[PDB]
Amino acid sequence: NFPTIDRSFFAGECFDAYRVLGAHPCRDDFGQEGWRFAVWAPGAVAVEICGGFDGWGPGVPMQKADTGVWSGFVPGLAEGELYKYRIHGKDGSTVMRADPYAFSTELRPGTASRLARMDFAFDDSSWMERRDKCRNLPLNIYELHAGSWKHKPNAGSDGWYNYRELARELIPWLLDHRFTHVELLPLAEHPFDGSWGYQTTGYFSVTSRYGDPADFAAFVNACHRMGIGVIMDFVPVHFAANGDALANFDGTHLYEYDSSEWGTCNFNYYRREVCSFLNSAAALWMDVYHCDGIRMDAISRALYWQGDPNRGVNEGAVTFLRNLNHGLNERWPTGIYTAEDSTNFLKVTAPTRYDGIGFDYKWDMGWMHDTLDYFATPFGERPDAYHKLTFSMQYFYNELYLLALSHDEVVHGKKTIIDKLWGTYEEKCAQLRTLYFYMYTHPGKKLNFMGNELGHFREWDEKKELDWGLMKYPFHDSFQKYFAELGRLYATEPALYDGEYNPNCFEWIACESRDEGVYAWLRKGAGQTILCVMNTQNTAHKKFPLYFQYPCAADELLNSEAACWNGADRSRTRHLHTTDGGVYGRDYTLSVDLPAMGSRMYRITPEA
Numbered sequence: 001n002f003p004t005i006d007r008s009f010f011a012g013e014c015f016d017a018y019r020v021l022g023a024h025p026c027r028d029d030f031g032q033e034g035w036r037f038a039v040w041a042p043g044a045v046a047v048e049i050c051g052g053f054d055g056w057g058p059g060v061p062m063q064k065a066d067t068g069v070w071s072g073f074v075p076g077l078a079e080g081e082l083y084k085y086r087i088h089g090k091d092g093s094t095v096m097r098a099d100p101y102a103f104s105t106e107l108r109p110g111t112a113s114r115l116a117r118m119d120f121a122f123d124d125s126s127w128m129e130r131r132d133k134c135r136n137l138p139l140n141i142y143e144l145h146a147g148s149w150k151h152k153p154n155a156g157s158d159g160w161y162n163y164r165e166l167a168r169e170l171i172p173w174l175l176d177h178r179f180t181h182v183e184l185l186p187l188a189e190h191p192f193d194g195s196w197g198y199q200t201t202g203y204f205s206v207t208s209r210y211g212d213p214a215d216f217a218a219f220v221n222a223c224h225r226m227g228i229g230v231i232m233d234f235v236p237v238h239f240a241a242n243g244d245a246l247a248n249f250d251g252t253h254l255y256e257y258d259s260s261e262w263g264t265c266n267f268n269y270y271r272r273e274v275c276s277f278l279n280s281a282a283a284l285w286m287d288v289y290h291c292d293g294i295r296m297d298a299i300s301r302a303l304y305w306q307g308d309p310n311r312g313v314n315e316g317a318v319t320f321l322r323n324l325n326h327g328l329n330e331r332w333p334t335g336i337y338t339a340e341d342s343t344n345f346l347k348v349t350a351p352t353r354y355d356g357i358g359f360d361y362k363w364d365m366g367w368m369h370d371t372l373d374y375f376a377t378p379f380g381e382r383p384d385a386y387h388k389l390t391f392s393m394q395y396f397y398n399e400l401y402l403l404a405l406s407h408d409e410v411v412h413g414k415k416t417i418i419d420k421l422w423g424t425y426e427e428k429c430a431q432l433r434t435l436y437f438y439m440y441t442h443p444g445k446k447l448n449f450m451g452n453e454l455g456h457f458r459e460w461d462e463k464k465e466l467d468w469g470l471m472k473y474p475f476h477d478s479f480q481k482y483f484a485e486l487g488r489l490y491a492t493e494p495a496l497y498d499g500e501y502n503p504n505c506f507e508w509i510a511c512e513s514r515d516e517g518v519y520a521w522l523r524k525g526a527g528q529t530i531l532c533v534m535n536t537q538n539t540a541h542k543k544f545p546l547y548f549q550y551p552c553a554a555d556e557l558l559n560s561e562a563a564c565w566n567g568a569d570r571s572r573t574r575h576l577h578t579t580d581g582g583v584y585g586r587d588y589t590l591s592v593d594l595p596a597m598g599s600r601m602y603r604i605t606p607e608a
């Protein structure tokens with residue numbers, strides 16, 4: 001007696017299809033220990049369970065239910081044994097395939113599925129009870145590729161850390177830099193290291209590059225024990241086009257549309273069982289591996305036909321994503337669900353009830369493009385481009401925006417963040433401190449790809465670890481300490497982390513200083529006040545006036561050009577007070593010395 005798929009599978013409403021489909025340990029009706037197998041292949045005329053158990057011969061015939069789910073049992077197989085399905089397709093094709101619901105796969109280039117128990121010891125119930133979407137908490141995400149952060153000494157695909165070893169090396173770095181979460185590039189199994197995980201073959205198969213399912217579970221458990229969250233990158237728009245993975249699965253276009261980019265195939269959201277596959281693949285990370293959220297790649301290529309709103313909204317994709325976010329929130333309401341959509345056509349982070357797509361956060365792609373465009377601009381041209389930086393706050397409250405400098409910006413000849421900036425080595429270093437000052441003191445949660453905190457010069461290559469040797473240079477060593485201090489201020493100051501999405505918590509102080517290239521604003525989270533001021537010109541400003549409506553003290557919290565961070569400023573004054581007189585409506589002046597390319601943060605204490 002084989003378990004039946006829940007009817008919700010055929011409704012596109014199943015989030016636990018992996019409890020039935022795939023390979024599972026069980027006893028047959030005669031009490032014999034073995035493994036049951038189930039695969040959805042409704043157009044297939046025959047399917048065999050194949051593996052080492054009969055030396056990769058004819059294998060075990062599966063029985064087809066009128067549901068199109070094939071089932072079979074093999075007695076006595078051990079955890080770790082290899083298997084595949086031989087699928088006799090509607091079109092007369094015969095293809096040996098990885099289990100699409102495999103929980104483990106041999107190391108690429110092998111695709112054989114491995115028998116795996118998915119019963120993991122977690123001791124993170126405390127972490128799970130405390131868990132939050134972080135609307136009014138620090139959310140400071142370290143985006144990481146698991147194969148190219150750090151390699152094992154004296155070895156780099158022989159020199160990969162196991163998930164357990166990676167957790168041991170990574171967690172202290174995250175804690176030291178006040179990162180709250182690691183966002184992993186997709187760990188679903190994939191054949192090509194250089195896809196970075198974005199060309200997926202094994203949606204349920206945590207990649208064997210870095211070890212076994214229990215090793216990844218141990219990674220997540222370790223993060224949770226130390227107060228670190230884990231966000232999984234997820235690829236629901238398209239799958240790798242490999243002929244023996246998901247394409248033409250039953251000898252018909254089953255997972256893909258019955259008729260565009262890369263070596264990938266687009267998922268058919270009008271196929272209910274495909275919606276259940278993707279629901280279940282997202283849920284796997286939350287359920288089996290206790291992940292704290294999902295970042296969904298390339299959502300604009302799902303939302304719009306050919307990724308172009310002018311070609312029309314894909315209403316099937318919109319309903320799929322609304323239903324996916326609904327089901328993830330029903331099961332894991334304190335999970336964090338994110339995407340991006342540079343078209344700004346649909347309301348990505350509005351509740352589905354108000355015709356939104358129901359994501360928690362949206363990457364602010366406009367902020368990233370406009371900010372980097374600005375700091376790439378020659379100093380002489382910045383007065384004309386002044387409002388390139390103020391523009392972000394005109395649309396900021398339209399979505400729940402997350403300020404992201406991701407892996408996509410530091411590859412393919414685009415240059416690393418520091419290498420994008422205009423000027424001399426010294427000017428690039430000074431502006432990099434001010435750029436991240438701006439990122440951490442602009443409202444919205446934060447994401448940074450590994451290497452941003454080192455001031456990396458070399459573009460990301462997944463074949464190489466980060467240039468850890470950069471820390472032998474004062475600039476890079478002091479920079480990663482400065483990055484940690486931004487994290488500490490962000491994590492500890494309610495002005496910065498509380499009420500980020502409340503327009504009453506942000507106020508411009510200097511937003512017309514075009515000639516000077518000076519910007520100043522208040523962050524006013526939780527009734528506390530922090531003044532943020534940055535000079536983006538290559539000349540200092542003496543006693544730059546900032547106009548206040550009330551008299552106040554200002555105590556320096558951060559100086560981006562301090563000796564501490566290899567900066568050029570030696571100023572000693574950290575305590576300022578307003579003078580009486582200013583401009584119409586703002587009768588008080590706080591006068592601040594601004595080093596060339598430098599930023600300062602002040603705690604504001606109003607007079608009573």
Ligand SMILES: OC[C@H]1O[C@H](O[C@H]2[C@H](O)[C@@H](O)[C@@H](O[C@H]3[C@H](O)[C@@H](O)[C@@H](O[C@H]4[C@H](O)[C@@H](O)[C@@H](O[C@H]5[C@H](O)[C@@H](O)[C@@H](O[C@H]6[C@H](O)[C@@H](O)[C@@H](O)O[C@@H]6CO)O[C@@H]5CO)O[C@@H]4CO)O[C@@H]3CO)O[C@@H]2CO)[C@H](O)[C@@H](O)[C@@H]1O
Nearest residue numbers: 425456457458459467469470471472473474475476477478
């Ligand atoms: O002060 C505390 C400090 O003490 C120690 O640092 C000392 C350090 O050990 C010692 O060597 C010296 O540092 C000197 C250095 O020796 C000089 O050569 C000079 O370095 C500058 C260099 O000449 C410039 O070319 C420039 O280097 C850039 C490159 O231009 C970039 O392309 C990039 O190259 C790296 C590349 O991206 C990577 O892929 C990889 O191939 O490695 C390349 C570099 O090896 O980055 C570098 C670095 O930004 O700028 C250099 C200045 O930063 O000047 C150095 C400083 O005087 O003296 C140090 C002070 O005593 C200790 O090791 C530190 O941890 C500690 O913080």
Ligand SMILES: OC[C@H]1O[C@H](O[C@H]2[C@H](O)[C@@H](O)[C@@H](O[C@H]3[C@H](O)[C@@H](O)[C@@H](O[C@H]4[C@H](O)[C@@H](O)[C@@H](O[C@H]5[C@H](O)[C@@H](O)[C@@H](O[C@H]6[C@H](O)[C@@H](O)[C@@H](O)O[C@@H]6CO)O[C@@H]5CO)O[C@@H]4CO)O[C@@H]3CO)O[C@@H]2CO)[C@H](O)[C@@H](O)[C@@H]1O
Nearest residue numbers: 383508509510511512513514515516518547583584585586
């Ligand atoms: O209380 C009621 C009151 O409210 C409003 O005014 C207030 C305003 O909302 C508030 O932001 C603040 O204003 C500050 C401002 O935020 C500061 O940044 C600062 O602005 C002065 C700036 O530092 C100076 O450089 C100077 O700006 C220059 C530019 O630097 C030049 O590039 C040039 O730009 C022109 C450009 O060349 C042209 O191509 C074209 O683009 O147009 C530009 C002209 O704007 O010239 C300008 C102007 O010389 O002067 C800036 C001030 O104008 O200081 C501000 C305070 O003075 O406080 C305001 C007062 O409460 C509302 O507008 C008022 O009517 C109302 O009374």
